[model samples]
Target: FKREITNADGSKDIWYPNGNLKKISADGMNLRMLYFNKDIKETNIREGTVKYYYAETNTWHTSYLDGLEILEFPNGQTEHRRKDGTVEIHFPNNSIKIVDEKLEEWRYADGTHLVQLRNGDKILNLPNGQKEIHTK
Candidate 1:
Protein backbone atom coordinates (compact mmCIF):
# COMPACT_ATOMS: atom_id res chain seq x y z
CA PHE A 1 0.00 0.00 0.00
CA LYS A 2 1.13 3.60 -0.57
CA ARG A 3 0.08 7.11 0.33
CA GLU A 4 0.65 10.32 -1.66
CA ILE A 5 0.74 13.91 -0.43
CA THR A 6 1.48 17.34 -1.82
CA ASN A 7 3.62 19.51 0.44
CA ALA A 8 3.23 23.26 0.86
CA ASP A 9 6.24 23.91 -1.39
CA GLY A 10 4.32 22.09 -4.15
CA SER A 11 6.51 18.99 -4.07
CA LYS A 12 4.86 15.58 -4.22
CA ASP A 13 5.76 12.86 -1.76
CA ILE A 14 4.87 9.21 -1.89
CA TRP A 15 5.18 6.92 1.12
CA TYR A 16 5.12 3.16 0.90
CA PRO A 17 3.88 0.88 3.63
CA ASN A 18 7.37 -0.61 3.92
CA GLY A 19 8.90 2.75 4.98
CA ASN A 20 10.12 3.69 1.52
CA LEU A 21 9.64 7.24 0.30
CA LYS A 22 9.79 9.01 -3.03
CA LYS A 23 9.84 12.77 -3.46
CA ILE A 24 9.63 14.89 -6.56
CA SER A 25 10.35 18.59 -6.28
CA ALA A 26 7.99 21.29 -7.45
CA ASP A 27 10.23 22.47 -10.29
CA GLY A 28 10.80 18.86 -11.38
CA MET A 29 14.54 19.45 -11.19
CA ASN A 30 15.16 17.01 -8.35
CA LEU A 31 13.75 13.63 -7.44
CA ARG A 32 14.81 11.44 -4.55
CA MET A 33 13.81 7.94 -3.57
CA LEU A 34 14.68 6.19 -0.35
CA TYR A 35 14.18 2.51 0.13
CA PHE A 36 13.31 0.74 3.31
CA ASN A 37 16.61 -1.09 3.11
CA LYS A 38 18.48 2.21 3.45
CA ASP A 39 19.31 2.43 -0.22
CA ILE A 40 18.84 5.76 -1.97
CA LYS A 41 18.54 7.11 -5.48
CA GLU A 42 18.74 10.78 -6.38
CA THR A 43 18.13 12.31 -9.75
CA ASN A 44 18.95 15.82 -10.94
CA ILE A 45 16.94 16.69 -14.00
CA ARG A 46 18.69 19.96 -14.78
CA GLU A 47 22.15 18.44 -14.45
CA GLY A 48 21.15 15.20 -16.16
CA THR A 49 22.73 13.01 -13.50
CA VAL A 50 21.42 10.14 -11.41
CA LYS A 51 23.09 8.67 -8.34
CA TYR A 52 22.24 5.47 -6.55
CA TYR A 53 23.71 4.28 -3.29
CA TYR A 54 23.57 0.71 -2.11
CA ALA A 55 23.45 0.40 1.61
CA GLU A 56 24.45 -3.23 1.91
CA THR A 57 27.48 -2.97 -0.32
CA ASN A 58 28.38 0.60 0.52
CA THR A 59 28.68 1.21 -3.19
CA TRP A 60 27.59 4.07 -5.41
CA HIS A 61 26.60 4.15 -9.02
CA THR A 62 26.29 7.38 -10.97
CA SER A 63 25.15 8.13 -14.48
CA TYR A 64 25.75 11.35 -16.35
CA LEU A 65 24.10 12.97 -19.38
CA ASP A 66 27.17 12.40 -21.52
CA GLY A 67 26.61 8.65 -21.38
CA LEU A 68 29.24 8.19 -18.73
CA GLU A 69 28.52 5.73 -15.97
CA ILE A 70 30.64 5.18 -12.87
CA LEU A 71 30.60 2.75 -9.98
CA GLU A 72 32.49 3.01 -6.74
CA PHE A 73 32.84 0.01 -4.52
CA PRO A 74 33.44 -0.18 -0.80
CA ASN A 75 36.91 -1.61 -1.28
CA GLY A 76 38.17 1.48 -3.11
CA GLN A 77 37.69 0.04 -6.55
CA THR A 78 36.06 2.08 -9.28
CA GLU A 79 34.68 1.30 -12.69
CA HIS A 80 33.89 3.71 -15.47
CA ARG A 81 31.94 3.38 -18.66
CA ARG A 82 32.64 6.05 -21.25
CA LYS A 83 30.42 7.38 -23.99
CA ASP A 84 32.70 5.90 -26.64
CA GLY A 85 31.94 2.35 -25.58
CA THR A 86 35.04 2.01 -23.48
CA VAL A 87 35.28 0.72 -19.96
CA GLU A 88 38.01 1.40 -17.41
CA ILE A 89 38.12 -0.50 -14.18
CA HIS A 90 40.34 0.09 -11.17
CA PHE A 91 41.22 -2.36 -8.49
CA PRO A 92 42.21 -1.96 -4.89
CA ASN A 93 45.57 -3.50 -5.67
CA ASN A 94 46.45 -0.51 -7.86
CA SER A 95 45.87 -2.49 -11.01
CA ILE A 96 43.72 -1.23 -13.86
CA LYS A 97 42.09 -2.53 -16.97
CA ILE A 98 41.01 -0.54 -19.99
CA VAL A 99 38.67 -2.15 -22.43
CA ASP A 100 37.52 -0.87 -25.78
CA GLU A 101 36.23 -2.15 -29.07
CA LYS A 102 39.61 -3.21 -30.38
CA LEU A 103 41.74 -3.99 -27.39
CA GLU A 104 41.81 -4.77 -23.73
CA GLU A 105 44.79 -3.42 -21.83
CA TRP A 106 45.63 -4.45 -18.34
CA ARG A 107 48.23 -2.90 -16.09
CA TYR A 108 49.13 -4.69 -12.92
CA ALA A 109 50.32 -3.19 -9.70
CA ASP A 110 53.75 -4.74 -10.11
CA GLY A 111 54.38 -2.97 -13.41
CA THR A 112 53.28 -5.82 -15.60
CA HIS A 113 51.20 -4.96 -18.65
CA LEU A 114 49.11 -7.04 -20.96
CA VAL A 115 47.27 -6.13 -24.11
CA GLN A 116 44.92 -8.24 -26.10
CA LEU A 117 43.88 -7.08 -29.54
CA ARG A 118 40.68 -7.81 -31.36
CA ASN A 119 42.60 -9.70 -33.99
CA GLY A 120 43.57 -12.39 -31.53
CA ASP A 121 47.02 -11.07 -30.76
CA LYS A 122 48.24 -10.85 -27.23
CA ILE A 123 51.19 -9.02 -25.77
CA LEU A 124 52.55 -9.16 -22.30
CA ASN A 125 55.24 -7.06 -20.75
CA LEU A 126 56.67 -8.41 -17.56
CA PRO A 127 58.09 -6.30 -14.82
CA ASN A 128 61.55 -7.78 -15.45
CA GLY A 129 61.69 -6.14 -18.90
CA GLN A 130 60.67 -9.25 -20.71
CA LYS A 131 57.92 -9.42 -23.34
CA GLU A 132 55.73 -12.25 -24.52
CA ILE A 133 53.67 -12.38 -27.67
CA HIS A 134 50.95 -14.78 -28.67
CA THR A 135 48.85 -14.99 -31.79
CA LYS A 136 45.62 -16.77 -32.18
Candidate 2:
Protein backbone atom coordinates (compact mmCIF):
# COMPACT_ATOMS: atom_id res chain seq x y z
CA PHE A 1 0.00 0.00 0.00
CA LYS A 2 3.04 2.24 -0.19
CA ARG A 3 1.65 3.42 -3.47
CA GLU A 4 -1.57 4.42 -1.74
CA ILE A 5 0.22 6.92 0.48
CA THR A 6 0.91 10.36 -0.81
CA ASN A 7 4.37 11.44 -1.82
CA ALA A 8 4.35 14.01 0.98
CA ASP A 9 3.87 11.24 3.46
CA GLY A 10 7.20 9.64 2.58
CA SER A 11 8.50 11.70 -0.23
CA LYS A 12 7.90 15.06 -1.92
CA ASP A 13 10.78 16.62 0.00
CA ILE A 14 9.83 15.60 3.47
CA TRP A 15 11.88 16.80 6.43
CA TYR A 16 12.82 15.00 9.60
CA PRO A 17 11.85 15.94 13.14
CA ASN A 18 15.28 17.56 13.60
CA GLY A 19 15.24 19.24 10.22
CA ASN A 20 17.18 16.52 8.46
CA LEU A 21 16.96 16.18 4.69
CA LYS A 22 15.00 12.96 4.84
CA LYS A 23 11.78 11.75 3.32
CA ILE A 24 9.19 9.90 5.38
CA SER A 25 5.61 8.63 5.32
CA ALA A 26 2.68 9.28 7.61
CA ASP A 27 4.04 7.77 10.81
CA GLY A 28 2.94 7.86 14.43
CA MET A 29 -0.44 9.32 13.85
CA ASN A 30 -2.45 10.03 16.97
CA LEU A 31 -5.63 9.70 14.96
CA ARG A 32 -6.09 7.86 11.72
CA MET A 33 -9.05 7.57 9.39
CA LEU A 34 -10.34 4.25 10.67
CA TYR A 35 -13.64 2.45 10.53
CA PHE A 36 -13.96 0.34 13.66
CA ASN A 37 -16.22 -2.65 14.09
CA LYS A 38 -17.43 -2.98 17.66
CA ASP A 39 -18.60 -6.56 17.14
CA ILE A 40 -15.10 -7.73 16.32
CA LYS A 41 -13.30 -4.98 18.24
CA GLU A 42 -11.22 -4.16 15.20
CA THR A 43 -10.55 -1.16 13.05
CA ASN A 44 -10.30 -1.03 9.29
CA ILE A 45 -7.70 1.56 8.42
CA ARG A 46 -6.39 0.77 4.98
CA GLU A 47 -7.70 -1.16 2.04
CA GLY A 48 -9.46 -3.92 3.97
CA THR A 49 -6.52 -4.01 6.36
CA VAL A 50 -6.77 -3.64 10.12
CA LYS A 51 -4.28 -2.12 12.56
CA TYR A 52 -3.30 -3.33 16.00
CA TYR A 53 -5.43 -1.35 18.43
CA TYR A 54 -5.99 -1.45 22.17
CA ALA A 55 -9.05 -0.44 24.15
CA GLU A 56 -7.36 -0.02 27.51
CA THR A 57 -6.85 3.71 27.20
CA ASN A 58 -6.52 6.34 24.52
CA THR A 59 -2.82 6.66 25.21
CA TRP A 60 -0.12 4.35 23.86
CA HIS A 61 3.59 4.66 24.48
CA THR A 62 5.81 6.26 21.89
CA SER A 63 7.77 4.30 19.32
CA TYR A 64 10.10 5.94 16.82
CA LEU A 65 8.32 5.95 13.47
CA ASP A 66 11.38 6.78 11.42
CA GLY A 67 14.21 4.55 10.17
CA LEU A 68 14.52 2.10 13.02
CA GLU A 69 10.79 2.09 13.68
CA ILE A 70 10.31 0.43 17.02
CA LEU A 71 8.05 0.36 20.09
CA GLU A 72 9.11 -0.31 23.69
CA PHE A 73 6.37 -1.58 25.96
CA PRO A 74 6.20 -0.97 29.69
CA ASN A 75 7.69 -4.39 30.30
CA GLY A 76 10.70 -3.80 28.07
CA GLN A 77 9.29 -5.44 24.97
CA THR A 78 9.76 -3.84 21.60
CA GLU A 79 7.46 -4.25 18.58
CA HIS A 80 8.08 -3.65 14.94
CA ARG A 81 4.90 -3.73 12.86
CA ARG A 82 5.55 -4.32 9.21
CA LYS A 83 3.53 -3.51 6.11
CA ASP A 84 3.24 -7.14 5.11
CA GLY A 85 0.78 -8.03 7.90
CA THR A 86 3.67 -9.33 9.99
CA VAL A 87 5.46 -8.12 13.10
CA GLU A 88 8.98 -8.48 14.46
CA ILE A 89 9.31 -8.37 18.22
CA HIS A 90 12.00 -8.43 20.89
CA PHE A 91 11.24 -9.84 24.32
CA PRO A 92 13.26 -8.78 27.32
CA ASN A 93 12.49 -9.05 31.07
CA ASN A 94 11.06 -12.55 30.58
CA SER A 95 7.74 -10.97 29.84
CA ILE A 96 4.88 -12.58 27.95
CA LYS A 97 3.71 -10.80 24.83
CA ILE A 98 0.94 -11.56 22.38
CA VAL A 99 1.61 -10.28 18.93
CA ASP A 100 -1.59 -8.37 18.18
CA GLU A 101 -2.61 -8.62 14.56
CA LYS A 102 -5.68 -9.28 12.47
CA LEU A 103 -5.97 -11.02 9.07
CA GLU A 104 -3.67 -8.08 9.30
CA GLU A 105 -4.12 -7.20 12.99
CA TRP A 106 -5.73 -3.77 13.00
CA ARG A 107 -6.19 -3.93 16.78
CA TYR A 108 -6.28 -6.51 19.54
CA ALA A 109 -4.94 -7.68 22.91
CA ASP A 110 -6.34 -8.37 26.35
CA GLY A 111 -2.66 -8.49 27.29
CA THR A 112 -2.04 -12.19 27.61
CA HIS A 113 1.22 -13.60 26.18
CA LEU A 114 3.61 -13.59 23.25
CA VAL A 115 5.13 -16.33 21.12
CA GLN A 116 8.00 -15.64 18.79
CA LEU A 117 7.41 -16.65 15.15
CA ARG A 118 10.54 -18.01 13.55
CA ASN A 119 9.59 -20.50 10.83
CA GLY A 120 6.36 -22.43 10.20
CA ASP A 121 3.56 -23.02 12.70
CA LYS A 122 4.79 -21.66 16.14
CA ILE A 123 7.63 -22.47 18.52
CA LEU A 124 7.35 -20.98 21.98
CA ASN A 125 9.72 -21.53 24.90
CA LEU A 126 7.43 -21.00 27.81
CA PRO A 127 8.50 -21.35 31.45
CA ASN A 128 7.68 -25.05 31.51
CA GLY A 129 10.38 -26.34 29.20
CA GLN A 130 10.52 -25.76 25.43
CA LYS A 131 7.16 -26.54 23.88
CA GLU A 132 5.93 -26.67 20.32
CA ILE A 133 2.18 -26.69 19.93
CA HIS A 134 0.49 -27.04 16.55
CA THR A 135 -3.13 -26.91 15.53
CA LYS A 136 -5.17 -27.49 12.39
lDDT of every predicted structure (CA atoms): 0.88, 0.37
TM-score of each: 0.64, 0.24
TM-score of 1: 0.64
Model 1, 4-59: lDDT tens per residue? 99989899999989899999999879999998799999999998999999999999
What's the CA RMSD of model 2 in angstroms? 14.8
For candidate 2, write residues 50-126 as lDDT tens digits: 33334343323333233333454555566765544356665543333334421221222433333434343444334
Cα RMSD, each candidate: 4.2, 14.8
Residue 21, model 2: lDDT of 34
User: Which segments of candidate 1 are over 4 A away from where they belong?
Assistant: 90-97, 101-136
Q: Report the Cα lDDT for residue 86, model 2.
A: 51
Off by over 4 Å in 2: 1-68, 93-136
